């Protein structure tokens, strides 16, 4: 989300993906592994936070007949204190979880980027904006070989090295 | 070959440890606000007291005649409920209310008191049934004739069950010192309740009170919890509302105060005066006094949890 | 070409999730400790009670003559304040104090109690004004002559306003039974008070207490809150400190107990006995009993938040 | 803050910056974008933590005339419990915020490092200590072109490739 | 050359912010569960009350004869302890218990009350020593002969020490009004107690009760705290259990309720009814009512903290 | 812990290490610096969390003689609320500490990987699975020179460049 200047609004298939522009045409295919990884992590956060409490609290006040003024002020004091505690814990919880979610997803993006970067050793070079310039015409079958992590990092070495 | 992440045109702003308003792809809610304006009692034995007050179920006014030996897992108190038919008041009323809310119902048992030499059918136009009556579980002991003399009587009751017994008696306060002699004879006039833990001791305080229920006399309702094999003794000679049946707690339940209808199709464990909070979220912003198994109340109206990546659209 | 980050010679050690004492570039404080030894009341209606007690403002001792109908947004109680001039005590005094702190002032109104056949100008040398006087809002009800017979009386008052009324009466306790028979005649004395939520019932207890104000007699001060259109009734015949004016809560305010001076140039919303806490930090380590809109009290003296990067010198 | 063995005490212009030593002379210019990024993030943390509470608590005790001993012990008990809760929350809050602040600044430093690395594709090589050895005499105007992200990654390729 | 990290065949599953059951190399426990079934009192002055009740140490029943002026840093209450020998009970008993638990011991001092014209040697067969005795620190005040008038008396005591004094007196309730007339005389009996911040005025309750210790009469104890240079005053004329020695708090201590043995070889600062919690972990799941310097109670049985890297074995 | 497909169960000397397979034989030596770094960080977490509280709480209830039912219900209510607060804080604390611990260890692993990568500039190439293919027979003494960070990045340049 840094050097990637913007996201792809047309990418409606997954959370991550590739958009290759070779000679044969163009392609935009979503990567399933990283997308499912971030989805499983966020789903873990959701399953962890959305929770039912088995602790039962009884009625300590009375809405129809007000209790003693002193013990009533003590009850309202304690209830207001606990309300402040849970408000703070909920605010800080939501904030921290959102931060770790954002940085987590960015971490997955960088994982994918450096993974495909490690797939192309000397046959391609970084461009700066999240692209890998290929020094040899990589056909659509070659692009599909890079997507499913089957691109041979040596059977295209000399050709791209000459370029 | 390039590679990037997805993005949406309309993200959802959330709050983070660093910034405030970071637009992510998707986000959900953690603070519940939707309320069901009904008391969800599906699968629970529910008693809607209605016009009957919770404490009256121990003394038995007319409006509580159908709640003398109730049994429930959820007790609902209504705003039109009344604990008394003859104008009176309970001492330590809220503690007894909190005892009866989690009592799981009450079971009455005859105390066996029998009387000789006085009148026992004291009744008032306020506690009307067929005609003028009194508290169902109580006895308004009068003099035998219109002034007469009230002999010193002593009545003892022993708890012979494995659970504590709820004993409730009353001290009568007439409109004046003279009507007190009309009901129990001239002079004083002393009541004495005793147990192993308890002992007291009442002298009637006759006088004019504010007209409640068209009467200026009051009745003080007192109570104590007898332990098994303990005995309570009543030595009196006038102005005594004697107990006729003791109460025993059935099991366990929950008490709520609401003003909405009862629904037997929805199910919930979080209740308040406005209805039932049915949610799976850890927080709620509906009622701070919600009872049962509720989410934790917070003052924030909305706290959006991020469920997507950082939305960097174009 | 090389690239790096900045550093300073004298960093600031902070605490992290991993280490303890990480020297960073710059850091700020999050726990407030600076205290203003004054009550900052800029922009607030403030009433410094001084020698007048908060409860006395309802009964009206001499020292409270200028606080009978006060109005304020911030009430300050002083250590030299006294609720009584004649030695006495308030029943449920702290609850009434907490009611009067957030009352926003009090407004008195004549209850309209007329008397016939007794001496109503009972006073004492402790409540001294010009000569010997009594509570300004109370009336010591005595018998007509030196002994005589105090006739039985009944006084009723209806709250004809939209706000609850504060009713305060007193039960007198003489130094001995002979002084009680002198002030109100022989026989049993009894005071009864009734309304819609209140009932009971007082009998005076004559006897010699500890000498306070050179007086061994006491006065018990009792109070209740009448609802709109609700009626209170008193039935007495002696040992009665009758109310003359009822109190009505004006609005809303805050009550603090302090011993420092009042300052009208500084402004703050957090107060304690030592002064005013003026800060924007989320925490404070000054007074755990600070009231108002205060930072959350913590027991840590300092919690440095890092505002710079990691300081790696040389 | 890792392979960068130490900081620059002479760098008083910003948080991050470059110090180039070519043939024409030497320079030390602070980078405004990353510095302003970390400054805006820390400023966000400060604006979020420094907060005023609108909840008002009333006086529940009495310093001049002590209340009932039982209810007073309950009040002191609840107040001590709440004090422990807020002390724990403050300690953990400060610690976590400091940790995420340090790791955040280090993350920005690595962002700048890898950004300048992606600017120089094959015309420079990493040295190991946070420097980029340039295989061609990059003049001061070329250094300024690298600072403002205008260095051409191809009009110096063959020269540095021969070296 | 390749490089990697270590792993183990048998890892330890922990819970993280993302997953639930991440197998790491090593992990430790953060929630304490091991309990020492003994009261670790190594290095602490410990007084095991045993059959003596904590409150009795102020009144002095036979079983508390060796605890009248105890001194300790840790007070242990036993289930077989009894505060009274003659049947009765303390009023505001729990507050006085909480005062005596952190008192660090008590120090008695003669209040110097002389009597003339009555008996001060009222004794009972329930408070037995050599023969029939009474409370060691109290004096049962009777009438000079059977029936006859108990004179009206007033006894005051001034706290001439720098610490608040604990004053405890008693009201007697006979088995009937005839017994009260025999012990103290006919007429309305009444006791009055007052100081500078106290006034209460008790009245006995001659009724009819069942037999605790074979006795149907009761003796209830009341208490107040005198301030330095403050004076207390009593006005009585029968049914009075007068105090003979006042109590002064020594210093500071801690009070626990346990049923296990006392061990002087183990040391700990966290106690509960089952024993001593000796641990350095921040949490514990043993007793939610543990007192002292304890880890924070949680409902989770185990919360494994990861101490190693992610275990990816083969 | 990502592209490193699995850990080394035979590595019992440290947390991180190298396993070189050259012509002379094979070696597996643990790296002390990174291992001691992660160990010191986890030890810091342990010393920070394992803590003794100096706050003393007194007995507010009574197990032998039950107190008033109303104030007893208030005490049980407050104690249950505080119990829920501390249970939540303990759960979230343990979860967060475990997350930051795992991500911390992975961060150290990546630090070591990229450090060894920066040691071998053009004399070796990444393979994709966490290894560095060397284009020249690096003997055991050369491997030991790489372990203690003394490998000369220039005295083997031309040989591996020809390959």
Give chain C as a 3 state SS string: CEEEEECCCCCEEEECCCCEEEEECCEEECEECCCECEEEECCCCEEECCCECCCHHHHCCHHHCCCCCCCCCEEEECCCCECCCCCCEECCHHHHHHHHHCCCCEEEEECCCCCCCCEEEECEEEEECCCEECCCCEEEEECCCCCCCCCCEEEEEECCCCCCEEEEEEEEECCCHHHHHHHHCCCCCCEEEECCCCECCECCCCCCCCCECCECCEEEEEEEEECCCCEEEEEECCCEEEECEEEEECCCCEEEECCCEEECCCECCEEECCEECCCCCCEECCCCCCEECCCEECCCCCCEEECCCECCCC
Q: Which residue of F has its CA nearest to A83?
A: F81
CB contact under 8 A, A69 and C92: yes
| Residue B209 per-residue DSSP state | -
Query: How many cross-chain Cβ pairs, C to E, lie less than 8 Å apart?
Result: 43
Q: Is B287 annotated as a binding residue?
A: no
Resolution reading in Å: 2.7
Q: Which residue of D has its CA nearest to B17?
A: D45
Q: Is B267 annotated as a binding residue?
A: no
- Select from F18, F47, F49, F20 the least CA-distant residue to F34: F18
Closest-CA distance, F5 to chain D, in angstroms, reads 25
Closest-CA distance, F95 to chain C, in angstroms, reads 13
Smallest Cβ distance to D100: which of B17, B20, B299? Answer: B17
What are the two backbone dihedrals, phi and then psi, of residue A116, each rounded to the nearest 5 degrees? -65, -35
Closest-CA distance, B210 to chain C, in angstroms, reads 5
Touching partners of E (3+ C-beta pairs < 8 Å): A, B, C, D, F
CA dist A20 to A139, B2, E273, Å?
A: 10, 6, 71
With H, G, I as helix, E, B as strand and everything else as coil, classify residue F156.
coil
CB contact under 8 A, F16 and E4: yes
Sketch the domain layout of chain B as residue ranges.
1-44+261-314, 45-260
Q: Which residue of B has its CA nearest to A58?
A: B291
Q: Considering only the top CATH level, what class is C45-260?
A: alpha beta
CB contact under 8 A, B95 and F84: no
What are the two backbone dihedrals, phi and then psi, of residue E302, each rounded to the nearest 5 degrees? -145, 140
C173 touches chain E (CB under 8 A): yes
Q: Are A163 and D161 in contact (CB under 8 A)?
A: no
Distance CA A108, CA D118 (A): 20
CA neighbours closer than 13 Å in the CB half-sphere of residue B114: 1
Directed axis angle between helix D32-49 and helix D69-119, to 10°?
170
Distant-in-sequence, close-in-space partners of E51: CB < 8 Å, separation ≥ 6 = E63, E78, E80, E81, E82
Instruction: Provide, as residue numbers in chain E, all residues whose Cβ is less than 8 Å from the Cβ of D65.
Output: 197
Work out whether the CA dihedral B236, B240, B245, B249 comes out positive or negative.
Answer: negative
Touching partners of B (3+ C-beta pairs < 8 Å): A, C, D, E, F
Instruction: Provide, as residue numbers in chain B, all residues whose Cβ is less than 8 Å from the Cβ of E216.
Output: 194
Q: Tell the CATH superfamily of the C1-44+261-314 domain.
A: Hemagglutinin Chain A, Domain 2 (2.10.77.10)
Closest-CA distance, D128 to chain F, in angstroms, reads 5
The CB density around residue E207, as the number of other CB atoms within 10 Å, is: 26
Distant-in-sequence, close-in-space partners of F162: CB < 8 Å, separation ≥ 6 = none
Q: Is B230 annotated as a binding residue?
A: no
What are the two backbone dihedrals, phi and then psi, of residue B54, each rounded to the nearest 5 degrees? -65, -40
Please name the residues between 100 and 129 in chain D that touch chain E, using a CB distance below 8 Å.
none
CA dist B105 to B82, B102, B111, F70, Å?
A: 18, 8, 19, 20
CATH architecture of the region A1-163: Alpha-Beta Complex (3.90)
What are the two backbone dihedrals, phi and then psi, of residue D124, each rounded to the nearest 5 degrees? -150, 160
CA E295 to chain centre: 24
Smallest Cβ distance to F121: which of D85, D89, D126? Answer: D126
- Joined together, the tokens standing for residue A132 give 């890998």
| Residue E227 per-residue DSSP state | P
Smallest Cβ distance to C232: which of B173, B207, B210? Answer: B210
Distance CA F64, CA E49 (A): 14
CB contact under 8 A, B99 and F69: yes
CB contact under 8 A, D90 and C102: no
Distance CA D131, CA D113 (A): 9
Please name the residues between 3 and 32 in chain F that touch chain E, using a CB distance below 8 Å.
4-9, 11-12, 14-22, 30-31
Work out whether the CA dihedral C247, C252, C257, C259 comes out positive or negative.
Answer: negative
F161 touches chain D (CB under 8 A): no
Residue numbering of the annotated binding site of C:
69, 107-108
Closest-CA distance, C17 to chain F, in angstroms, reads 7
Instruction: Provide, as residue numbers in chain A, all residues whose Cβ is less than 8 Å from the Cβ of C95.
Output: 68-70, 73
Touching partners of F (3+ C-beta pairs < 8 Å): A, B, C, D, E
Cβ burial of E277 (10 Å; 0-12, 13-18, 19+) is: buried
Percentage helix, strand, coil for chain B under 3-state DSSP, each rounded to 5: 10, 40, 55
Distance CA A119, CA E259 (A): 70
Closest-CA distance, B13 to chain D, in angstroms, reads 15
D52 touches chain C (CB under 8 A): yes
Q: Are B97 and B165 in contact (CB under 8 A)?
A: no
- Joined together, the tokens standing for residue B21 give 């308003």
C220 touches chain E (CB under 8 A): yes
Distance CA C3, CA D7 (A): 10
- Determine the Cα angle at E58 with ends E57 and E59, to 5°: 95
Distance CA B200, CA F83 (A): 40
**Terminal Cα distance for chain F, rounded:** 31
CA neighbours closer than 13 Å in the CB half-sphere of residue E256: 32
Closest-CA distance, F86 to chain C, in angstroms, reads 16
| Residue E267 per-residue DSSP state | B
CB contact under 8 A, B209 and C156: no
């Amino acid at each position: 989300a840094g050097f990637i200047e913007n996201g792809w609004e047309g990418l409606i298939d997954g959370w991550y993906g590739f958009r290759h522009q070779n000679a044969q045409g163009e392609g935009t295919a979503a990567d399933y592994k990283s997308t499912q990884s971030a989805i499983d992590q966020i789903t873990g956060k959701l399953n962890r936070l959305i929770e039912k409490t088995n602790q039962q609290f009884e009625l300590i006040d009375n809405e129809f007949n007000e209790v003693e003024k002193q013990i009533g002020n003590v009850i309202n004091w304690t209830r207001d204190s606990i309300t402040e505690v849970w408000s703070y814990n909920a605010e800080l919880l939501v904030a921290m979880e959102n931060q770790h979610t954002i940085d987590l997803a960015d971490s997955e993006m960088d994982k994918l980027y450096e993974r495909v970067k490690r797939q192309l050793r000397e046959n391609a070079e970084e461009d700066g904006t999240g692209c890998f310039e290929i020094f040899h015409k990589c056909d659509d079958d070659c692009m599909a070989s890079i997507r499913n992590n089957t691109y041979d990092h040596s059977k295209y070495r000399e050709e791209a090295m000459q370029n | 070959i390039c590679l990037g992440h997805h993005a949406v045109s309309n993200g959802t702003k959330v709050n983070t440890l660093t910034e405030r308003g970071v637009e992510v792809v998707n986000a959900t809610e953690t603070v519940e606000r939707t309320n069901i304006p009904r008391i969800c009692s599906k699968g629970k034995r529910t008693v809607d007291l209605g016009q009957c007050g919770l404490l009256g179920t121990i003394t038995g006014p007319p409006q509580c005649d159908q709640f003398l030996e109730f049994s429930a897992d959820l007790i609902i108190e209504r705003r039109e409920g009344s604990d008394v038919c003859y104008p009176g008041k309970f001492v330590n009323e809220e503690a007894l209310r909190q005892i009866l809310r989690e009592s799981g119902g009450i079971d009455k048992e005859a105390m066996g008191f029998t009387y000789s030499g006085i009148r026992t059918n004291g009744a008032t136009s306020a506690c009307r049934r067929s005609g003028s009556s009194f508290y169902a579980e109580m006895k308004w002991l009068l003099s035998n004739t219109d002034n007469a003399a009230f002999p010193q009587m002593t009545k003892s009751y022993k708890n012979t069950r494995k659970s504590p017994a709820l004993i409730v008696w009353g001290i009568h306060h007439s409109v004046s010192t003279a009507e007190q002699t009309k009901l129990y004879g001239s002079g004083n006039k002393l009541v004495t309740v005793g147990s192993s833990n308890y002992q007291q001791s009442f002298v009637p305080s006759p006088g004019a009170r504010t007209q409640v229920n068209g009467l200026s006399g009051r009745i003080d309702f007192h109570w104590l919890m007898l332990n098994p094999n303990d005995t309570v003794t009543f030595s009196f000679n006038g102005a005594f509302i004697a107990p006729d049946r003791a109460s025993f707690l059935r099991g366990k339940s929950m008490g709520i105060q609401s003003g909405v209808q009862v629904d037997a199709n929805c199910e919930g464990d979080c209740y308040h005066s406005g209805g039932t909070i049915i949610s799976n979220l850890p927080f709620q912003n509906i009622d701070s006094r919600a009872v049962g198994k509720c989410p934790r109340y917070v003052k924030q109206r909305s706290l959006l949890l991020a469920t997507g990546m950082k939305n960097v659209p174009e």
